Amino acid sequence: AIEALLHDPLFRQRVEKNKKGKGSYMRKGKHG
């Protein structure tokens, strides 16, 4: 059970978007 659970998606690698980074450009801001 341990092994397959690990394989399952909920435990996929997470990466975050950047605010001053390379892939930063926000077309519309969170707030107007």
Binding site: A1, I2, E3, L5, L6, L10, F11, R12, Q13, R14, V15, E16, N18, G21, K22
Partner: protein, 324 residues
């Protein structure tokens, strides 16, 4: 400190409504010879009596050292009452002993265990994470006067370790590591990604207690493995250089595994008839470590990792005990 002590002592009081009523019930119906004629009943009473007995001896300290403290401890600690404040150190010790007792005593808890560490997704990063995890457990073992026997270790290609399976033996090993078992999450800016964006990798930790002639094959690769084919799980050893010893080691691990497969399945079946996420996380950016289960957070990750946090383990154990 005093407050802490009080808090600790309150737990002990928590087992006063259990001990008295239970005791009364036992003497009223179980102690009787005409009840005794049935063995099962007798056994039950004995179990019940065991509960009582625990409460008797250890509560005295809680009560006796509490009530006698206040009169002499109040104003003076340094002069003349330097014994009298460290007289309550004894009480503290007793309390600890009680707490620890409560935590342990549960099935298979004394017999040593063999935790496998399994990595997660991320690939290269993940293997490093696994290695780190392994290191922490090793340090914990070192800390707690244990002896670790390194069975499986397997390097990952780009970096780190793919698979490991480490067996420690000594004084109530399994008990401590039995909670850990499950997913441990590494939330930190990868050293391998040039961007240095925060990542998340994982590690399974399988932790198991230690506990046919033609349906097993033993193959050499000086290395050794004991493949119990009917179930279908293999074990592979590489600890010692001598072959027979290695084989023996393999055998015990395999046996343990067999038992594990059995027991869990049985339990499931019974449940049928009648954690989701990561257990822990370690968030190095934030210098921050939430155990998601049991709601404790340690703010020095380094300390935890260098050598695994006994305190955290104790909390986890307590939770597990409660669930049981």
């Amino acid at each position: 400190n005093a407050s802490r002590n009080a808090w600790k002592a309150s737990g002990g009081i928590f087992d006063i409504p259990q001990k008295e009523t239970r005791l009364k019930e036992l003497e009223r119906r179980l102690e009787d010879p005409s009840l005794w004629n049935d063995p099962e009943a007798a056994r039950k009473v004995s179990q019940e009596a065991a509960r009582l007995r625990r409460t008797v001896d250890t509560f005295r300290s809680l009560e006796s050292d509490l009530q006698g403290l206040l009169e002499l401890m109040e104003e003076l600690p340094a002069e003349e009452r330097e014994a009298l404040k460290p007289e309550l150190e004894e009480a503290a010790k007793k309390l600890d002993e009680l707490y620890h007792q409560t935590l342990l005593n549960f099935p298979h808890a004394e017999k040593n265990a063999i935790l496998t560490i399994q990595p997660g997704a991320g690939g290269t990063e993940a293997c490093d994470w696994a290695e780190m995890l392994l290191r922490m457990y090793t340090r914990f073992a070192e800390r707690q006067g244990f002896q670790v026997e390194v069975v499986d270790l397997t390097p990952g290609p780009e970096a780190g370790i793919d698979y490991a399976q480490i067996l420690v033996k000594g004084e109530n090993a399994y008990g401590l590591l039995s909670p850990e078992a499950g997913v441990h999450r590494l939330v930190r800016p990868s050293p391998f990604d040039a961007s240095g964006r925060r990542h998340t990798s994982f590690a399974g930790v399988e932790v198991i207690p230690e506990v046919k002639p033609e349906e097993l094959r033993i193959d050499v690769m000086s290395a050794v493995r004991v493949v119990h084919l009917p179930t279908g799980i293999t074990v592979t050893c590489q600890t010692t250089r001598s072959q027979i010893k290695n084989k023996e080691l393999a055998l015990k691990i395999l046996k343990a595994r067999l038992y594990e497969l059995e027991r869990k399945k049985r339990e499931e079946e019974l449940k049928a008839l009648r954690w989701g996420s990561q257990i822990r996380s370690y968030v190095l950016d934030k210098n921050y470590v939430k155990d998601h289960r049991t709601g404790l957070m340690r703010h020095d990750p380094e300390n935890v990792l260098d050598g695994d946090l006994m305190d955290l383990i104790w909390a986890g154990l307590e939770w597990k005990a409660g669930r049981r």
